[PDB]
């Protein structure tokens, strides 16, 4: 610090509050605008329904068309794109299915070579993709 005395508290309190308010992560984590812009609203998981299946292209260095699912939410109705975790599981998902959408790991940020899409699918038709991938259960039609 700079100011050093006995009765020096107000100026340093104002300095601490202003320089903490000028931080970026603290401003993101303590204002209602970022919580309003978040479709989940601080929720770990949020179920939705499927209206279309559009696969997005890859990025500049690598070229592999990775398939994705557009899911409309129920609590908000916003159209957010999800991403299938494993290989060949797009046959496990159909139109107007009961999917469960969660985050991917970067606190709501784009990850890797997939542009724009930030979410994924962990459960479809009230069963996980792991059981369908390992063939432990069967999706009921």
């Amino acid at each position: 610090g700079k100011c050093r005395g006995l009765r020096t508290a107000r100026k340093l309190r104002s300095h601490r509050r202003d320089q903490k308010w000028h931080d970026k992560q603290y401003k993101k984590a303590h204002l209602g605008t970022a919580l309003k812009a978040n479709p989940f609203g601080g929720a770990s998981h949020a179920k939705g329904i499927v209206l279309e299946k559009v696969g997005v292209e890859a990025k500049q260095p690598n070229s592999a068309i990775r398939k994705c699912v557009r899911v409309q939410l129920i609590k908000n109705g916003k159209k957010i794109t999800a991403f299938v975790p494993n290989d060949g599981c797009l046959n496990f998902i159909e139109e107007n299915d009961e999917v469960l959408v969660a985050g991917f790991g970067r606190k709501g940020h784009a990850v890797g070579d997939i542009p724009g899409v930030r979410f994924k699918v962990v459960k479809v038709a009230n069963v996980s993709l792991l059981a369908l991938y390992k063939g432990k259960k069967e999706r009921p039609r």
Partner: protein
């Protein structure tokens, strides 16, 4: 080929091999002890070039 937007190709065409038998373990009591006596007691890593326990030379 032909239809590019088709998923599950690498598992759609592959080879399927069944499983095999399974022995008895020590539930980690002497399993890591066998790890110790087959990793450091018998063989040692060379100073400069390492040698793992699964290095099938």
């Amino acid at each position: 080929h032909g239809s590019l937007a088709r998923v599950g190709k690498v598992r759609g065409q592959t080879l399927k091999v069944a499983k095999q038998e399974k022995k008895k373990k020590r539930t980690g009591r002497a399993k890591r002890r066998m790890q110790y006596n087959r990793r450091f007691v018998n063989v040692v890593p060379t100073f400069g070039k390492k040698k793992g326990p699964n290095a099938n030379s």
